[PDB]
Design a protein around this ligand. Structure first.
Ligand SMILES: [Cl-]
Ligand SMILES: [Cl-]
Lengths: 351, 350
């Protein structure tokens, strides 16, 4: 054991010096000893980022290698042994791992309660996790996956999720892709609020549909916005009181339809989960004066949202929606256990 | 006067049919008749966006024009006669204008009280403003300006500010350029708060220093972050109790120094007013758990902010800074009148 570990992981940065683990090039992936505030994981599976997996594979065929599984396995071993992590040297992306807890430092900042032997899922990118690959048992090119024998380091600032026993693995991973949306949405929605959810039929949208209705209450109004009429039954069954049929980029129709459904009062909270570009202004114009706009999708442009509210004089609050919040994994899993209709849809669509 | 005008201004969108004025490519810049919820302005000056002005200027330089002022003047008249607005056709930038009120629609949603003949400043972009240029009196290449004779349309959703009589015109306009900064800061900071302002020496930064200090109070802590030691006296004179010397991109140094100045308690509010890229994570790591991070600068990347907080497990509230708020022009101009230190700095630098 080594004392006084940095919660952000600077103690394992080798090159360049004075930088954080993710932008760094070389990390210390020595697993023979861990710091007092680290957690050691026995990695069984690596879920490499899809764009990174395709770039590595296509780089190998053009070099060019015959057995891609052997070339990819040796490429991952050489990269993680040389750089200390599985960060793509051309793009910069990584991924996440699956494994079992091996050792918990005494000073480790516990988030979700886990003990040694618990099966957990990484929620931070492989571009900052010190990783040591001892053996690649299988390379799954149709799955961007690597069944390996190895160990990884989670810093005290890292995020992880204990995989539950009452749900299968890949199903549990489906809810953690969007677990930050319901955890953050339930903070914004007050009782009797009118909530507009752009993308209510989506993966995170149906979770936000349920959470918005729980928080708004019997006298709140949850309004979904979808593209197709056949999405309406799913929106209502997941919590939406009303459903608007319009394109997510159609600011005028969404504004007028929210206006008609609210008698001009508009929405207290606007949740955007479409992952479609040029949806900032439709979200802004749906909110009332001093309303809240929650941008969960990575397709959001900071410039288009800020300049958008300016040009139309909308004094609204605009949130950069995150993928992490306190206990977000346990909250999202608890939501599915309490709502059988929500759990049914999630298992049939994202098993 | 035409009835049932759209407050967002879609009634003047020509092409394509169904979009808002700003993303639209052709606007109706007719000025013979206005809608009931518009305001007509007699334009005196066009303050083109610097990037747009320099891009158009360099394009004309790279076309082979010998009289640049003439080429730019013709370019603006041709652009506004064809598209109905001075939206840059290559970038997306526009600008703002100065003028005097010519006509006010009956059902115009008044924000700041103005009457016919009042001198006002546009706070919305020219890329959504219907504009008709009748004559370009002079092009000021070194100022990105155009003294013209023309008219512009302000929609009911538009934003404007009445220029005060008790201040120099370019004094007040320097304040309106960052008028949203003090208005939002006095909403974010509670008494006894620890506030970290990254870019405390800039134009909006010194405004944020003063408002943060009066809202945080005698038992609050305002910490400024600047790259140059010479900015310290300005930071402390404008409200900062402590000043950290670090590059705005240096997340590790800011975290360690904020931790030292707060005994590990970190900042309740982090205000980013550096127009510098890759400052999201330095702003995130300065905030305490469940703290507030307000990104004001246009150099902020949404993804870098989203992924930044994920990788280090920061449950912080991150806000897209809004340059508009209720009464932000009157609030900002009043702060300059109340703060002689700020008025002296704004007069000397802007
Ligand atoms: Cl309400
Ligand atoms: Cl750094």
């Amino acid at each position: 054991m080594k004392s006084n570990g940095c919660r952000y992981g600077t103690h394992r940065v080798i090159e360049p010096k004075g930088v954080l683990p993710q932008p760094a090039k070389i990390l210390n992936n020595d697993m023979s000893e861990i710091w007092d505030n680290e957690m050691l994981i026995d990695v069984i599976r690596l879920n490499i980022d899809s764009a990174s997996f395709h770039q590595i594979k296509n780089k190998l065929i053009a070099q060019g290698h015959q057995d891609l599984e052997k070339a990819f396995a040796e490429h991952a071993i050489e990269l993680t042994n040389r750089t200390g992590k599985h960060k793509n040297e051309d793009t910069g992306s990584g991924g996440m791992f699956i494994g079992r807890v091996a050792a918990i430092g005494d000073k480790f900042e516990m988030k979700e309660e886990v003990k040694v032997g618990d099966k957990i899922a990484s929620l931070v990118s492989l571009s900052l996790t010190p990783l040591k690959i001892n053996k690649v048992k299988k390379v799954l090119l149709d799955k961007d996956q690597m069944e390996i024998e190895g160990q990884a380091i989670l810093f005290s600032s890292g995020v992880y999720a204990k995989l539950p026993d009452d749900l299968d693995e890949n199903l549990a991973l489906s809810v953690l892709d969007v677990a930050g949306a319901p955890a953050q949405v339930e903070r914004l929605v007050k009782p009797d609020d009118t909530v507009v959810i752009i993308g209510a039929n989506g993966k995170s949208g149906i979770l936000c549909n349920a959470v918005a209705k729980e928080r708004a209450g019997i006298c709140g109004k949850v309004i979904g916005v979808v593209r197709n009429e056949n999405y309406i039954p799913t929106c209502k069954a997941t919590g939406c009181d009303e459903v608007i049929l319009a394109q997510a980029t159609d600011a005028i129709t969404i504004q007028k339809e929210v206006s008609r459904l609210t008698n001009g009062k508009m929405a207290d909270v606007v949740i955007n989960v479409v992952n479609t570009e040029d949806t900032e202004l439709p979200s802004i114009m749906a909110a009332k004066d001093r309303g809240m706009v929650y941008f969960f999708s990575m397709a959001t442009s900071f410039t288009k949202a800020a300049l958008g509210a300016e040009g139309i004089g909308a004094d609204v609050d605009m949130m950069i929606g995150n993928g992490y919040a306190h206990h977000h994994s346990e909250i999202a899993l608890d939501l599915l256990r309490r709502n059988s209709v929500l759990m049914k849809i999630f298992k049939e669509r994202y098993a």
